[PDB]
């Protein structure tokens, strides 16, 4: 992927690690499902 | 989000599903670490 979008993804992950709120929306269900497919659990 | 960036993230997840090796690089270590923090593991 292009380096700017990677930087945006780093910023997104940094946000989620401090406040995973956005992940609990319907918009982000696909992302939760992907994490779950890898054996993870999105925390509260 | 920017709906366009949600779209890009969906496309990125699709790409990673199709070819998990995209996540194996040092550039993507931050993403592996995030997944591991949630108890998952990126596929081989």
Query: In terms of residue numbers, what domain contains A21?
Result: 1-44
Q: Cβ contacts (< 8 Å) between A35 and chain B: which residues? A: 35, 38, 40
Report d(CA B9, CA A31) in Å as an integer: 8
After which residues is chain A discontinuous, taking C to N > 2.5 Å?
none
Report d(CA B41, CA B1) in Å as an integer: 26
On whether the CB atoms of residues A7 and A14 are closer than 8 A, the answer is: no
Token pair of B15, please?
Answer: 């790409």
Token pair of B9, please?
Answer: 């993230």
CATH number, domain with residue A39:
6.10.250.3420
Three state DSSP letters for A1-44: CCHHHHHHHHHHHHHHHHCHHHHHCHHHHHHHHHHHHCCCCCCC
- Nearest residue in A to B33, CA atom: A13
A9: number of Cβ within 10 Å:
20
The DSSP H or E segment spanning B35 is helix B29-37
Residues 6+ apart with CB under 8 A from B20: B42, B43, B44
Domain tally, chain B: 1
The structure was resolved experimentally with: X-ray
Best of A9, A27, A28, A41 to disrupt the B interface by mutation (most B CBs within 10 Å)? A9
On whether the CB atoms of residues A10 and B5 are closer than 8 A, the answer is: no
Inter-chain CB proximity A38 and B42 less than 8 Å: yes
User: What does R_g of chain A's alpha carbons equal in angstroms?
Assistant: 11
The residue among A26, A30, A31 whose CA lies nearest residue A13 is: A31
Resolution, angstroms, 1 dp = 1.1
């Amino acid at each position: 992927m292009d380096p700017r979008k990677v930087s945006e993804l780093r910023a997104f992950v940094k946000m989620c690690r401090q406040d995973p709120s956005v992940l609990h929306t319907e918009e982000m269900r696909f992302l939760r499902e992907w994490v779950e497919s890898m054996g993870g659990k999105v925390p509260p």
